[PDB]
Design an enzyme around this catalytic site. Structure first.
Site, PDB file in Angstrom:
ATOM      1  N   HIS A   1      -0.362   5.962   0.550  1.00 27.83           N
ATOM      2  CA  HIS A   1       0.424   6.184   1.747  1.00 27.83           C
ATOM      3  C   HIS A   1       1.552   5.182   1.944  1.00 27.83           C
ATOM      4  O   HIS A   1       2.383   5.381   2.824  1.00 27.83           O
ATOM      5  CB  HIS A   1      -0.447   6.375   3.000  1.00 27.83           C
ATOM      6  CG  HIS A   1      -1.055   5.122   3.542  1.00 27.83           C
ATOM      7  ND1 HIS A   1      -2.416   4.981   3.714  1.00 27.83           N
ATOM      8  CD2 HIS A   1      -0.493   3.987   4.016  1.00 27.83           C
ATOM      9  CE1 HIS A   1      -2.673   3.792   4.229  1.00 27.83           C
ATOM     10  NE2 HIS A   1      -1.520   3.170   4.428  1.00 27.83           N
TER      11      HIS A   1
ATOM     12  N   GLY B   1      -0.951  -3.381   8.630  1.00 28.28           N
ATOM     13  CA  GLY B   1      -0.578  -4.255   7.534  1.00 28.28           C
ATOM     14  C   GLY B   1      -1.739  -4.598   6.599  1.00 28.28           C
ATOM     15  O   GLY B   1      -1.525  -5.125   5.526  1.00 28.28           O
TER      16      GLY B   1
ATOM     17  N   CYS C   1      -3.923  -2.546   5.104  1.00 26.77           N
ATOM     18  CA  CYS C   1      -4.205  -1.600   4.019  1.00 26.77           C
ATOM     19  C   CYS C   1      -4.038  -2.278   2.664  1.00 26.77           C
ATOM     20  O   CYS C   1      -3.141  -3.118   2.439  1.00 26.77           O
ATOM     21  CB  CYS C   1      -3.303  -0.393   4.088  1.00 26.77           C
ATOM     22  SG  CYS C   1      -3.545   0.579   5.559  1.00 26.77           S
TER      23      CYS C   1
END
Lengths: 4, 305, 305, 4
Positions: C41, C143, C145
């Site tokens: 993503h 932030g 991920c």
């Protein structure tokens, strides 16, 4: 044997 | 979101851990540049632990009595001295993985991460508070001696604790890195009692703020109180008195939530007087006192190292 | 003695963390050898979050689109590639800090350490369980991920989780390192919900053994029960059933303490029916289910890595 | 903005  | 008991990343401290053996006694040391720091009771036998004369014990040892191992590499000892309760072994190799560091003495109520080690190798990492009676509630077995506690401030490792002993009650005692014990304890197997412990009020408030930040709000009320009225109540329940200094340190959290400190104090007052009353907060059914306000800011703001 | 929620030492994982940017989007990557792994993503932007065409988005991307940063160093991406929900950025440099590692897929009820990271730098480490509904109760901000979960065996890092998202309830979801989601979740900003979570029964028992090892035995009684008189009170209260492997994994703790796996299964039945009557176990007033029987052994034995 |  608590003095680690 | 979410809120966890969270430790500092341990890699900078892992590369400093070594094994120190003297006779048949093994424990951990901390290797910073060309010195290994460890608990001095490494030089005792059980014929000595009744009433050890450490100076006299150290006089009888030579450099060759100290075996230091860094993984597989033996580090040769080229000098020894004692600073309070810490043995400083000079070695013939400076550690290339030494972080930027300092030695600090923490104050009661403050928290730090412990890297629990055996045989110079890491076992696990967890967070502890220095209790108001100068013990910590850790997890240590025989051989954990020399494991260290630390904070990381910007880029710098602040070493604040070295583990020395467990007390009869099952709590733990140790020194700063200059070898001075926190509290009234000595590195001897004698009957030793701690002061009565107290709850770290400022940290409970910190944690209630953390809870609000993460959506747990049921304990909030419309009331506000005064520092004096709050302390009259809280001190009956064995809570530390709240001071203006503490109110100031909570400012960032009061700012974040828009709940004044003396407003949150009226929530805490109600929680003490009526209990958790069958509810939970951040997954706990008790009031938690081992997060500092700085711990909450760190975790909720995503600080890195 | 003492018993704490303890994480694995995070050093080996720390040297694998990098910052991956694509457009305005920055998250964390895992740099193993000459491959940086990260959530796919990362290549979305704006309205893509609803029904992204991953295949199509990746075609529109150059190897030159991905900025990969390991400290001051910028790394050169010479390849890209998708595997399920993970991107792989091939780079010109293999990670010299690459540890012994493998990729594994954990089961519901097992625990692991998370190294929470932002901008390719570590923030902190904590332990958690894969819940039976395939979520984790972590602590992650925007932030984070690309932060991973891991266990350690000897010197080998078993990577088992990469963080992708937070659900509306505040719990967390992600993939294994092959990019498959745990649970019925997709990497799209769409309404998705977990199954009702259950309590990890074998883990509760493990924690009761840990309490006995550490002195807490007020909850032990003279009584015993059987599996399916125990299961009667139990699943009524959304507790997991106990498998064959579960009991076999509890033998070491019953061996340690002298208390049969079925006879503790009975003390738990009674705490379920009646509660703790204001008493605590290992500093908790709730039944804790995020220690596995392996965790208890590791911590109580002093296993190192 | 929950895809972290």
């Amino acid at each position: 044997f608590x003095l680690f | 979101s979410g809120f966890r008991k969270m430790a500092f990343p341990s890699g900078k401290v892992e590369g400093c851990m070594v094994q120190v053996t003297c006779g048949t006694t093994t424990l951990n040391g901390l290797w910073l540049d060309d010195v290994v720091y460890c608990p001095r009771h490494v030089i005792c036998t059980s014929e000595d632990m009744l009433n050890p004369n450490y100076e006299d014990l150290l006089i009888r040892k030579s450099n060759h009595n100290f075996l230091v191992q860094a993984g597989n590499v033996q580090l040769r000892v080229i000098g020894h001295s004692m600073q309070n309760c810490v043995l400083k072994l000079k070695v013939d190799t400076a550690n290339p993985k030494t972080p930027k560091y300092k030695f600090v003495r923490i104050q009661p109520g403050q928290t730090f991460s412990v890297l629990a080690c055996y045989n110079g190798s890491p076992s696990g990492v967890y967070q502890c508070a220095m209790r108001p009676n100068f013990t910590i509630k850790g997890s240590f077995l025989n051989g954990s001696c020399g494991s260290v506690g630390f904070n990381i401030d910007y880029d710098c490792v602040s070493f604040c604790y070295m583990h020395h002993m467990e007390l009869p009650t099952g709590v733990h005692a140790g020194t700063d890195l200059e070898g001075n014990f926190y509290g009234p304890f000595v590195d001897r197997q004698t009957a030793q009692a701690a002061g009565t412990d107290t709850t770290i009020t400022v940290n409970v408030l910190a944690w209630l703020y953390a809870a609000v930040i993460n959506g747990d709000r049921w304990f909030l009320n419309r009331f506000t109180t005064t520092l004096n009225d709050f302390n009259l109540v809280a001190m009956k329940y064995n809570y530390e008195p709240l001071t203006q200094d503490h109110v100031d340190i909570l400012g960032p959290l009061s700012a974040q939530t828009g709940i004044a400190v003396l407003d949150m104090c009226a929530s805490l007052k109600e929680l003490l007087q009526n209990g958790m009353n069958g509810r939970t907060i951040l997954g706990s059914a008790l009031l938690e006192d081992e997060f500092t306000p700085f711990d909450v800011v760190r975790q909720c703001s995503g600080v890195t190292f």
